[PDB]
Design a protein around this ligand. Sequence first.
Ligand SMILES: OC[C@H]1O[C@@](CO)(O[C@H]2O[C@H](CO)[C@@H](O)[C@H](O)[C@H]2O)[C@@H](O)[C@@H]1O
Ligand SMILES: CS(=O)(=O)Nc1ccc(C(=O)O)cc1
Ligand SMILES: CS(=O)(=O)Nc1ccc(C(=O)O)cc1
Ligand SMILES: CS(=O)(=O)Nc1ccc(C(=O)O)cc1
Length: 358
Amino acid sequence: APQQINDIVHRTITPLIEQQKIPGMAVAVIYQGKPYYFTWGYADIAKKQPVTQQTLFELGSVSKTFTGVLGGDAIARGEIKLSDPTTKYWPELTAKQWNGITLLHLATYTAGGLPLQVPDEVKSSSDLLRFYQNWQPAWAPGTQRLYANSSIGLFGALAVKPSGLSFEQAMQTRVFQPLKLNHTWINVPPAEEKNYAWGYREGKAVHVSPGALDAEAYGVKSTIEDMARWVQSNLKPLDINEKTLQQGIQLAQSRYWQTGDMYQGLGWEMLDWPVNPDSIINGSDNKIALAARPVKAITPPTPAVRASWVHKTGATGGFGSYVAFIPEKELGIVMLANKNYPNPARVDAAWQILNALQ
Ligand SMILES: OC[C@H]1O[C@@](CO)(O[C@H]2O[C@H](CO)[C@@H](O)[C@H](O)[C@H]2O)[C@@H](O)[C@@H]1O
Ligand SMILES: CS(=O)(=O)Nc1ccc(C(=O)O)cc1
Ligand SMILES: CS(=O)(=O)Nc1ccc(C(=O)O)cc1
Ligand SMILES: CS(=O)(=O)Nc1ccc(C(=O)O)cc1
């Protein structure tokens, strides 16, 4: 690898791992479009299995980027419109608070305060309908952003309905396969278990638990190689041969709402480049709190801006992930770890690496 990439990555990540007590980590840097990989530590401490370029990590909420792109692809296919009422796709949602809530609102956390989680007690399709029928919004649609798995998760479920495919089958056929993400999974097959890292929480080995709308909000597992290829695809969508997927990628990076210095896409979030990273490390967008923030509608949405810092953080109980990229510079990073550690530390390390290389 180029020595400058080797050095900035090792010098940044080695102390991160020590400070955060991360058992295992994989990093990819995409530099002038090409990937470079780094690994440390253990995928399974007890079995002494190292992290490799084939180790699967739980992406947690980085999964929302896949959901957003899949939704984008459905729009491009003419199957859904973001301006459609939720009730077009779920007519059983008859309760009156749903009037005026569109697929856009679901996808962008702007429906009026949908809850962070679908409750664990929701086990069936009837339970899920009851949950959404009984939810009482805090605010009118399109007024505040409040991050929510129940919002984008429902978007993902509805977005695939016209296709006639399960969410998983749609994701596989329409996103993973065309992009050659052959080691990316919603459900880890038995054959891949040897490669599936354990997550570590309070020193205990853990994997994410099943839950309603898990696949749609937090349920993808992938390798550092597939995640680098996901970054490459999002950096340079015009190289994608499947036109609806190319268009879908672009739609996911469109800017729909602004709060402070951040713009909400479909799954992806964006800041104008050059960035001052204070807001994403120390300030309002550092993800430490669950924050209700007023939004300004971008009417119409700005097409994907090349001079952006495009990113998403994610975690599960045992994992912490981060992806960021800058299309104009052909530059990006993926950081996958098998411990959940604070988001500001992730962003600070990513910034240190990409700011050095840009
Ligand atoms: O657990 C699914 C999903 O939800 C998030 C928040 O988006 O984490 C929540 O759930 C965890 C498991 O119970 C909690 O430990 C955590 O405090 C909570 O916010 C994601 O991190 C996770 O993938
Ligand atoms: C981002 S857009 O082009 O769809 N414009 C919108 C979207 C939603 C609203 C709202 O009030 O809910 C207003 C304007
Ligand atoms: C602190 S939390 O566990 O609720 N996780 C969050 C909360 C909010 C956001 C956001 O994008 O606003 C992201 C992650
Ligand atoms: C077509 S769009 O996506 O830009 N959405 C808009 C545009 C304008 C207005 C308005 O009230 O002026 C509202 C919503």
